[PDB]
Symmetry: C4
Subunit: 305 residues, 4 copies
């Protein structure tokens, strides 16, 4: 069975009713459509209001249908060339112009506010956030760890960030209840506050595999047989702009390399630090026990001399 | 006595002074009124400023009252047809136009900013968030649990979210002090960070009923006799738009089904995952102890062979 | 010596350099000044640009100084009456109009964005938040507690909120180092998550005075002799508008009543709940030990029969 | 090797692809460039659209190239002087004006929204936040502490804030894996909630050096030999404006003074409190053990009489 979360963050699960937030529907559109909406939205008002001037036919230099348009438009954009102006003969025309120019300001506001979000939406910001292409399991100061690399491709922004991971795996309860996509938080710094990143250079996020880890009894041999997927979420804030952004990826069982290690990316240069973003996804192997974490602990606690 | 929080989130408790944030009063209005405000707001300025042109009567082609309006309007919307223009004979008229066109820009700003929030307000966003219609109590890996289902009806948005629950119940302290609506947080993931949802598909939020649970000594038999209400709060963020949203529901004692279980909603399809949102509210029963959690623990701790 | 934080939230401590955020300086102004800024800001541009038209004197119907203004204004607000229009005789005038109408759009943006925040700033929102006028110390299910009341005067908004309190008191370290306003967090729900309020009706925030409380050894007799001040902070979110708000108050030693209790405010009405906001600040006394919490615990632990 | 984080917050690490968020690229620009962009952006549209009027040559008083501009401009800014107006002879010209005035409103929105953020961006706000120029290590109620001073130079804003610190130091794991910039959170209030500042007056942030501190075995003698750097992050919220801001500094090994103490800044004045911001960075020495924290604890635990 395929994956739940793609490496680019999108899910693989499918769900009229969403008309509750049409605005949200409007921002997620590609520009081509978005403009086309606004093209239409303006015409339909200019059609409607023009057809009320012709119902009112106060008028200067107006003939067939086409003539009322160039006015209704020039009135609403507030152009008013002066070839088509207003008289005071009728009560009706003089008040339409007010409702029109009030309402013309509404449509503009729906548009400006509409545009702001569209340009300001930070999905674009978080596009420079990056997760290592694989995860690794290997030893680190005696303890076996699951590790992935995190980083932002721009220097200038989002240095504050925070990381979290969920393990998605099927489960059957003792009572035989089946949970297809049961999920459990994977400890990556929460209790100590080490999940609050400071993205100077790309970081290796580590999860120490201990008695509480879902990974406690997985050995090297078991891993390939396990059907599990780690979703990895990063939420940070753009320095230049208050707003916050999410970025996610996934690691499926076969993208977890046992007994590897991440290539360093940071190196010294003419008395400076340069991040070699080419070694970003790069790993390498090292002698690493084949045993589960649980069995390592046991072996270790029985060696006390 | 009736409920405190309706299933749609609104409270059932009633509280001039709120004139402190008139802006907030303005957004919570239904459009019909909102536009009517702005209709009025524009007229009253056009009335006031027009009545200052007539006090100043610099003027071109102006007769009775109606004539000053079409100018004051055309000056403030900055139409200026050119049938009614300005001369330099008077000092007063030339400076009014500046205060007017400065002030006309203020009113517009109150309106645009007013509209932005109105369209952007995320009450509409959170309308697709949904809580199961009931809660269930039943066993799960040996431990008795209170469970409700959570989900968002759209795929495209708010996948990050976070859940919390409060129990509302009357209390008398030993000292005899009476607390009508005493509330206590109900553990749904806080300590482990499992209250930070990832809404791929609708989730069963679980509360394990343990020595700290307010539900520790409620048996199946007791439950119906208890007068309690669980308020359930969900706060997440719209992917497409930075802003965050709240959604709430309530479960009153009679909407807690003892010995049931939630129908799975997720199923496989042609090598894919589809959420059958029809089974969303659906539960079913299973053999489940009738005992309180406290008495189960006891019975269990005395069985150690 | 007087208080550090007034009951309305403002501090009593005094601190050119703040020109770093002139925008922030602009919003905190009272409207009278704010408008006066914008009045001036517009004139000074209309003065400058008009004086560049007169340097360029492309022109129609322009005499003395006053004539260039009504154009520069009509060009920048984009009125353009058509009594003063443009010719193509000069290269200079034709390009000024572009820089002008580009720059005129900048000033407007500084103003609209300036206004938005001014109206949207939520200091006004949090004005309906309210703290009890006093705090009380008295017993509650065996444990001695410090309690203050919290609430929002509007029904319609900010039901989610969160509370925190700091105790400000002078300190000398063993090493004799003097800390005038040393502050310590006062536990009001943090560890259990009970500091995450749900403001249905006004709540009694409680702090259980235990071995970790700064209040552990204060008896009834000691209290008046103590020189301490509790600052109380409330941060919630306006339902109708995403943004968050702070509200603070203070309790100084003499506003802590020992052996009292808050009048209930909530009562039943024709099968409903009504909050009697008149009893909001109201307390009353009850028989309450005079002893410190520490000495109560001792007396209690020695009574085990 | 030099420092990772400058005292003003900027990093010393270097990283086309950033075209993903051009908007963010646009705000981080200095005004000179920003305006120049908008100058250009407007001209290029006025060039393009003017060249479509000349392709359409509906026209009044239009000669060479220069004449179409003053129209295309007056149409898009919606000036329309009335010397160059529209006729109904052609179908094409009448519809261009609509696409033009729709599209003219788009460019404006990109600009206004562009300006808002630029003025509202809070990098400017956080410029008044300040960190002591050094850190100190010395004793405090028996426990050895690392201390730095924090404060905001304005009274009127950002009183709520929150502090966090990371220690950056090289590491080699037992397995010989090398971590150049390994970082660990430094405890400054997280567990007790004392990292949630209330910036009445500048505060001394303290980190008690205990068995969990990275500083546990550093003695006075060792310190100078250590190659370590403390990054210090402050995130608070501007009262007058909802938005939040980050401010950072760094302390490198030689800016940690052993056996010093911060000069008090707060003093009493005519029955008031005044902060003498001149003594802000000022420290002074006091008799302080030369031993590491670890060795002090030992010596202390062996003295129990
Ligand atoms: K925690
Ligand atoms: K005109
Ligand atoms: K916690
Ligand atoms: K905590
Ligand atoms: K205009
Ligand atoms: K005009
Ligand atoms: K005009
Ligand atoms: K914690």
């Amino acid at each position: 069975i395929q994956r739940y979360v793609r490496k680019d963050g999108k899910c693989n699960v499918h769900h009229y009713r969403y008309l509750t937030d049409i605005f949200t529907t409007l921002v997620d559109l590609k520009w081509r459509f978005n403009l086309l909406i606004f093209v239409m939205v303006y015409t339909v008002t200019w059609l409607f209001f023009g057809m009320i001037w012709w119902l009112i036919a106060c008028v200067t230099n107006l003939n067939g249908f086409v003539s009322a348009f160039l006015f209704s438009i020039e009135t609403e954009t507030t152009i008013g060339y002066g070839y088509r102006v207003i008289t005071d003969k009728c009560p009706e025309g003089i008040i339409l112009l007010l409702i029109q120019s009030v309402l013309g300001s509404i449509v503009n506001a729906f548009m400006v506010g509409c545009m702001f979000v569209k340009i300001s939406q930070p999905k674009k910001a978080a596009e420079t956030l990056v997760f290592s292409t694989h995860a690794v399991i290997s030893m680190r100061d005696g303890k076996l760890c699951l590790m992935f690399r995190v980083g932002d491709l721009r220097n200038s922004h989002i240095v504050e960030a925070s990381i979290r991971a969920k393990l998605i795996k099927s489960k059957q309860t003792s009572e035989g209840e089946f949970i297809p996509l049961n999920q459990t938080d994977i400890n990556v710094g929460y209790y100590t506050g080490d999940d609050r990143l400071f993205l100077v250079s790309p970081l290796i996020i580590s999860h120490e595999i201990n008695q509480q880890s879902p990974f406690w009894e997985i050995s090297k041999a078991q891993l390939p047989k396990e059907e599990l997927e780690i979703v990895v979420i990063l939420e940070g804030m753009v320095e230049a702009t208050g707003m916050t952004c999410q970025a996610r990826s996934s690691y499926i069982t076969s993208e977890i390399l046992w007994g590897y290690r991440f290539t360093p990316v940071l190196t010294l240069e003419d008395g400076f630090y340069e991040v070699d973003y080419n070694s970003f996804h790069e790993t390498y192997e090292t002698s690493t026990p084949s045993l589960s974490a649980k069995e390592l602990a046991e072996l270790a606690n029985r060696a006390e001399s």
